Amino acid sequence: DNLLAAIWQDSKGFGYATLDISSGRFRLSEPADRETMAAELQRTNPAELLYAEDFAEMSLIEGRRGLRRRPLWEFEIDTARQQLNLQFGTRDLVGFGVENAPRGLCAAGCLLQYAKDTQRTTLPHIRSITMEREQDSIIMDAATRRNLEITQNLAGGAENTLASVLDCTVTPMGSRMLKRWLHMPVRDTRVLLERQQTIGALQDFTAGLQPVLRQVGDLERILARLALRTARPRDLARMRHAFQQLPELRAQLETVDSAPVQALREKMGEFAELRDLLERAIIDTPPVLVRDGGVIASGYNEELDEWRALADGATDYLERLEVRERERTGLDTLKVGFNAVHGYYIQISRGQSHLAPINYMRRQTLKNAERYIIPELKEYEDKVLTSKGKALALEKQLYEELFDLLLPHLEALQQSASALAELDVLVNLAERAYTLNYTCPTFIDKPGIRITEGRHPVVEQVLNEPFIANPLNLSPQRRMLIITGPNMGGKSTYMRQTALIALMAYIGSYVPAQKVEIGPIDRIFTRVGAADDLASGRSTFMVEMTETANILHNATEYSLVLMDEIGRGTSTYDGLSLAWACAENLANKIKALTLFATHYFELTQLPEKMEGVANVHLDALEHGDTIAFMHSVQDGAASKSYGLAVAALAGVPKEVIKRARQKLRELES
Amino acid sequence: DAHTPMMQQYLRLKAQHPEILLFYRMGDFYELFYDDAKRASQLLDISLTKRGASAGEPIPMAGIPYHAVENYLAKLVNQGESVAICEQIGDPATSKGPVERKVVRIVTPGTISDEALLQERQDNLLAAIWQDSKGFGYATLDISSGRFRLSEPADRETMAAELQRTNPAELLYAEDFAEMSLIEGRRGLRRRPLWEFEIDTARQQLNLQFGTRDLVGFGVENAPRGLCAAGCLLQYAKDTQRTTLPHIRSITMEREQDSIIMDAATRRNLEITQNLAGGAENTLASVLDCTVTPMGSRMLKRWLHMPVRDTRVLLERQQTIGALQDFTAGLQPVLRQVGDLERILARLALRTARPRDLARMRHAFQQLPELRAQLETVDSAPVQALREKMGEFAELRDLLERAIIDTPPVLVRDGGVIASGYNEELDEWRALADGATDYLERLEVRERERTGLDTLKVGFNAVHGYYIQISRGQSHLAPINYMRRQTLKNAERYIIPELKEYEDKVLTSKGKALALEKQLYEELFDLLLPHLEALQQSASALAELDVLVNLAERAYTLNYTCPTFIDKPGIRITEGRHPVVEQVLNEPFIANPLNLSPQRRMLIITGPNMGGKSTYMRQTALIALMAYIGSYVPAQKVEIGPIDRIFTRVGAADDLASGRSTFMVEMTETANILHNATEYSLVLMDEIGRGTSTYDGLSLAWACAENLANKIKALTLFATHYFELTQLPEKMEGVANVHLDALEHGDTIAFMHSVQDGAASKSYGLAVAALAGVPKEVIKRARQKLRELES
DNA sequence: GATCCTAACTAAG
DNA sequence: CTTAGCTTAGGATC
Ligand SMILES: Nc1ncnc2c1ncn2[C@@H]1O[C@H](COP(=O)(O)OP(=O)(O)O)[C@@H](O)[C@H]1O
């Protein structure tokens, strides 16, 4: 009725745009597949649709109403980015989070040009352009995925990350499954509850299953390499070892009562005929490269054994012929050797070399020993050389026939691998749950997070000092906590453990706290750290404000926002002013479950000034030169940073601290 | 106390040296334990591992090989972290407890900005000198202290300078010393035998005295000429004292030339090779790495991260960059064809080269004569040396051209890799094998006409050998002579005694040909191997040549100019630009003058946000680094005085664990600056006191700057949005205000990007946030609040 | 007195 | 790319 929309196509994917003239909501989508395009067009019900002249799939477009064939110049990549930036008055669209989306921006440029064509009126309604994601998974921007340190810390090391604490998974194919899960938080309650039940039920039988799962091996990538018919023999030997161990895994899982544990038990399968084939057709320990040979176990084919028996018959006949030739010639120095260049030979000392009979013919010649070829030996060596090659060639042919026999079940083996990988993450999540004293979360139907005896998993485990437990109550009635406290007080640790508890709750895992009440959460936003992209023309402040803009644009009521102290990298007064307005918009309008840690103590008045907002104070007491921190979240607002005290513990010289305290006396007066 | 015997010994040795990252020799591998591992891991980029637990949780361990120490040891000391190298002094045999370890050497940051390192009046300095083809080897022993120094100079100037610097009380020279003139001035001159300067006797004599098995820990094992001198000196120490002295327990390196010390934080804050995002793109290296040869790419990235202070080396690069500038376009194409000579030769060294790689070796030797000829025309002392050092290796050119096919397959097992006619035998057996393919067709014709079957086609299966495949229609028509071995739906495969005898010839010829090639492909490595030493020198020279022509091409392309060395603390830049930003951004970079000096030691760079405060601050260092890697700087004129340390502290991020807060790390790293900094050191600071409350941050900043000026006297650029510290210049001498400015014409703000004298009073934050993309609703309330806050 | 895991590279496919 | 090969000590438990 008022949803003027644009569509445009490129070879890789298609681009959709929607402008609400009435609302001023400007939205952007990039749906590559046709089903989503049809669904989104039906969902929107565009009042008028613009359609590129050069669009191939006319069928999708032809059904829609208010159809307009539009020129290609309106769908230009460059003209769109500048036209939108000019209207907004910005230099880049990185703040809106649409800069990276080209196809939608193309559509948006044509729509903005058609917005002028339709109205040409005042356009203050168009200040922003959002990108609506259809994942139905918690959407975490790459900035957050490194700020919370989910899998990668700020230094870039795999150590001191959430994944490190929760990745005791015994199979390397399960390590990848969990790291997939941590970055893709399933938002549907029904799936998380199945994992939660399975984690709780397997908790009894963790110790029994975890050892048997280790023996499976990296089955996922072995199947992928088998699919490309380039598995190599040590990999097929790992497939055999798994099929040996699957029956044990099935039996232990039979005892475990849960319906999904029974489904994974049945989905794992047996594949006993493949167990039989690999056991029959591969030697206990083959080499890693097939071209070398020694891969095919004796019993698989009769013909391999016949030619291998000729080759084995050659190696005994080598010693038997060496003994009979040594006795018949009467030469003790007579020794039989195989040089690849000159084939099999008879090497005698030069002293007895001329005494070797006429049948002996020098193929290889050295001064110290002479290497001869008897005609009987030559007939046998020709037999050895032709058998050696045929055996190697047959080995490769059978090693291909094995692929052909194993290939049909690959579909079910892939399902088996997915199930066994899933099981290892689940029994790993059951082990860490019991080992680290985690609990099961519950899902209330309304956005909010209620934590009792809440702990930051990484810090508490990797610091040899008791973590003081912190209670949290974020709800629709209490949407913001201004966490103001002394430096090293725990204001930023208390802030971050809210979102790591929230994330772990949403990949189906047990959580650090004693009790959790996690409501629905759509996105986890953070502004933490500091950096300057001088090469991409962004000062340290701009990058900070670009990420504050991402939050202020794309945050909803259902979103958890964890802003660190902001307004840093401008003058005192200017930073405080921007921080007050940022927090107000996050509370009075956005209504996001927010923790706003600030060393600025003027913002401690915001709960009195605004509704549905509260203050909390991680406190410390300054006894002597040293400062003692409580590490305890208590209600109220801390008035003092004790920065000059936290600098003395940092190692700043006493001379510098003394003058700074003398200056603080003057500054306060 | 309650730990394992070895970790007990580690902790009591670790207790002696509290902040010193201690290298502990656990058999083959030096490795750091507990916190020192986590210090080692994030600096040296070795993999952190958890070894078996000792009276608690597992021990975090981070290790290196014994012979790669000096490579890593350099990367540690150049980031400021002093290394405590701890050898196995005791025998690992007859040690039921841990092998006894003692801290033989403490390699400091190596700050040698002070002109009088060794005093001129310092006597009882018994010294030794010996010379070979490569250069001189000098040693100095102070017997009274037992303090030992070891130097191996490359040119006469350093030898004369070091002899003058030391002023040895007694000098032991050698029977064969060529440049007698340098040592003629030196007092207590003694002509000494060659056996006292034998390399083998020197290594055991030093090891025996210190009680070690190797000198790799002291970092002198690899250095032969100095060790020869040290052996004669140590032998003459026994001769003079007629005793062994425990004072002389160690041998350090006197010729440790101070690379400008840059902590790992700075090496990523300047983005020398790795930007803050971690990508190879938008780094200094990216701008200066258009080097055509992969062997050269790693050479300049090595150079960028070791900015050497020695003027002699920088001048050789400066001259060669200027001289080759004419023949950039001529040499750069010919250098590309050489290939990665570094990596091919490394494969030749392990005797495990692919034949495709030896074909790339041939291609280089083809192109080397052309390179020498072009370089002959360019007359310069180092360009002629690199021209001669490159070499020809014509006999290897001949061998590879004779013994490798124009384009060989990727493995030798593939076959045909060895060029026919290098050996008579290979072509004779290959000719027998080639005899098969015509014999195939000639019996496919003779059998087709004798049988009279037109559909008859002869084929070879690997499993069933050669066969006679005939359609089922003509399969029953095939004669009795034909014997069906292999049976298919559309065709029957027969066999003839002539095809069992011929196929045996084809399969024994095929194998013999393949076996001979492998043998020859090994004989080639034996013939090429002797010259590897000189080929390695050639590779080092060709790599060096390519960074120099790249730097020469980029110098002319980007209009860079030769820098000047005042040799008095100061920096004097006119028309300088940030190399990365102007190259990687469409808009012309506005050039900026800088005038640091002893009279003007501090500039409080206060300006609007994104005014160019941080680029002007880094631009100083990147110009300074490029000047000390002997490259042409981005400028019109530069007079860079001595710098021992570039400190950078722009922005902070917290681990949020293990006692780290945004504030904790900022104060700890300003602490590093406030203690380690010298009058020679360049300090760069952005708004220290960001991670703490308003009044506490200003107070700490005013004390930090005062100490940096009134005491440390460091060439400092103190960027601050705090405008209270703009008053510091009046209070203390040698501090001045500077203002990167911008003009607000309308709602939008234009940044001038020009360093002008004065102090800007206003930070245009709310305006630079609107251009960042913060919603207008947020900006409007923030401006309304700023009105209230200011009032 | 003995017995597992450990630390940089290499490079074939 | 890329997933497989790459080294002297330690330590206990009688
Ligand atoms: N709840 C807590 N219990 C115990 N220690 C804590 C707690 N919260 C933080 N810490 C400790 O505080 C230090 C980090 O403080 P941090 O919150 O980063 O300071 P700031 O709030 O000023 O940014 C670390 O030693 C960390 O272990």
Ligand SMILES: Nc1ncnc2c1ncn2[C@@H]1O[C@H](COP(=O)(O)OP(=O)(O)O)[C@@H](O)[C@H]1O
């Ligand atoms: N001289 C110049 N000419 C053109 N662009 C410049 C110049 N100096 C800086 N810039 C650009 O403007 C930005 C300067 O911001 P910066 O100096 O980092 O500010 P801040 O000190 O607040 O961090 C950089 O991103 C750079 O791309």
